[PDB]
Design a protein around this nucleic acid. Structure first.
Ligand SMILES: [K+]
Ligand SMILES: [K+]
Ligand SMILES: [K+]
Ligand SMILES: [Mg+2]
Ligand SMILES: [Mg+2]
Length: 136
RNA sequence: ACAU
DNA sequence: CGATGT
């Protein structure tokens, strides 16, 4: 603790895992939805969590914002730190879209800089992250 | 185990 | 109950 209220919170939503994946980012303080990705027909939870963080980085950089990003995903936070999404999802025609987006997110990380702190949302202490989809 |  | 991850 405590929550850094001046921040952006992101989360994934899915129908199946693997399954249809979407994500959104919200203002932690107000819950205002700031971006939402169009559903991707097949992906994993962790790919979506990773894309959500990287999109948040790009969103904040474009707006000259130094706010931190909260994510509840230990996995995706590490993948962003490493600049490498170590997903097990098969690469085939059905998964080509998500894998293109993941590849492109890695490429952006490898060609840009940021100081944005990427923080673990402490669900056990604080309840669900403010960007949660309410599907569980 | 822990995080989803 | 199933799956994705460190
Ligand atoms: K949910
Ligand atoms: K959660
Ligand atoms: K497991
Ligand atoms: Mg999540
Ligand atoms: Mg959630």
């Amino acid at each position: 603790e405590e929550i850094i209220w001046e921040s952006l919170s992101v989360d994934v939503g899915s129908q199946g895992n693997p399954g249809i994946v979407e994500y959104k980012g919200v203002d932690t303080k107000t819950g205002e939805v700031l971006f939402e990705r169009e559903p991707i027909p097949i992906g994993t939870n962790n790919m979506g969590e990773f894309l959500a963080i990287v999109h948040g980085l790009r969103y904040l950089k474009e707006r000259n914002s130094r706010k931190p990003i909260y994510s509840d995903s230990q996995t995706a936070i590490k993948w962003v730190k490493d600049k490498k999404a170590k997903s097990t999802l098969v690469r085939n025609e059905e998964t080509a879209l998500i894998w293109k987006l993941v590849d492109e997110a890695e490429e952006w990380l490898n060609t840009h800089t940021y100081e944005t702190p990427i923080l673990k949302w402490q669900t056990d202490k604080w309840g669900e992250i403010k960007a949660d989809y309410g599907r569980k």
